[PDB]
Amino acid sequence: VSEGVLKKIAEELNIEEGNTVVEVGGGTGNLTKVLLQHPLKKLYVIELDREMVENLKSIGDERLEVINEDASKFPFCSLGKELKVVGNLPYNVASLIIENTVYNKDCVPLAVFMVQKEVAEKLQGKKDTGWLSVFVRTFYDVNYVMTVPPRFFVPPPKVQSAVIKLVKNEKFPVKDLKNYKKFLTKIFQNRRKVLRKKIPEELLKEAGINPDARVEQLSLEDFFKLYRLIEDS
RNA sequence: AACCGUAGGGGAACCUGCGGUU
RNA sequence: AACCGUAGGGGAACCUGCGGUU
């Protein structure tokens, strides 16, 4: 019964007069249907399928703009100055869409996704993390919206996915995001090794971080403290 | 930036060892 | 055998360093 669940997602977006809203990763149809019931301005569906895009021939309201490219490698700031990305995220490429969206932090203050409880709990921080989580929480706040049991989907799957809300909250200023990504990949590479091995000790000692500690024991402010030293000062 | 080659990261499909339940 | 847990095997997107070509 997607009826109920799809409404809750639009409700959470808070759509007003001058709102541009981009849907990512369709493949169902009814996603746009329920969104177009809200006071929109411009709506863009990003759908990978060349057959699904042709299903714009449902009602064909001239206030849409379906864009046939892929959501995981798209530049969002090409569209608008303040965007509200929404989308049910497929389990396989879910990571890439989130990485992709944060890159456009400047032109997207709010984003709401249907991911997967494990993928979501990882992103939150509380239950232990990966680099992608740190990348997100650097520029956004992840918020648990609601759980969805394996019945509200087309079939009943093996996972119980959850809805997440991402409100913009840049924690510390960062000039090059790719530079910053490369940094996190360098720290998270080979998780179980001591920090000292991965990064020059002269800088671990600089921060409050014990060099013989592990990358898991770190927490946001730790990641900031030493990055501000990495690109120098 | 794209694309070859190259070195890693990554971590889906599937495969198996052990344990719990039917 | 199936499902959950657990230890690996395996390695799809995709990212990155270096080199070449545009």
Curated annotation (Swiss-Prot):
Sorted alphabetically, which NCBIfam families does this protein's record hold? ksgA
What EC class does the entry list? Answer: transferase
Record carries keyword Cytoplasm: yes
Can you name this protein? Ribosomal RNA small subunit methyltransferase A
- A GO cellular component annotation in the UniProt record: cytosol
Lineage, uppermost ranks: Bacteria, Pseudomonadati, Aquificota, Aquificia, Aquificales
At which positions is S-adenosyl-L-methionine bound?
A: 25, 47, 70, 88
Q: Reaction catalysed by this chain?
A: adenosine(1518)/adenosine(1519) in 16S rRNA + 4 S-adenosyl-L-methionine = N(6)-dimethyladenosine(1518)/N(6)-dimethyladenosine(1519) in 16S rRNA + 4 S-adenosyl-L-homocysteine + 4 H(+)
| A molecular function GO annotation | rRNA (adenine-N6,N6-)-dimethyltransferase activity
Entry's family note: Belongs to the class I-like SAM-binding methyltransferase superfamily. rRNA adenine N(6)-methyltransferase family. RsmA subfamily.
Annotated organism of origin: Aquifex aeolicus (strain VF5)
Q: Which UniProt keywords apply?
A: Cytoplasm, Methyltransferase, RNA-binding, rRNA processing, S-adenosyl-L-methionine, Transferase
Cross-referenced PANTHER family: DIMETHYLADENOSINE TRANSFERASE (PTHR11727), DIMETHYLADENOSINE TRANSFERASE-RELATED (PTHR11727:SF7)
| One of the protein's GO biological processes | rRNA methylation
Report the InterPro entries cross-referenced here.
KsgA/Erm, rRNA_Ade_diMease-like_C, rRNA_Ade_Mease_Trfase_CS, rRNA_Ade_methylase_Trfase_N, rRNA_adenine_dimethylase, SAM-dependent_MTases_sf
Q: What is its EC number?
A: 2.1.1.182
Record localization: Cytoplasm
Role noted for this protein = Specifically dimethylates two adjacent adenosines (A1518 and A1519) in the loop of a conserved hairpin near the 3'-end of 16S rRNA in the 30S particle. May play a critical role in biogenesis of 30S subunits.
Hey, where's the site called Interaction with RNA on this chain? Answer: 92, 185, 189, 191
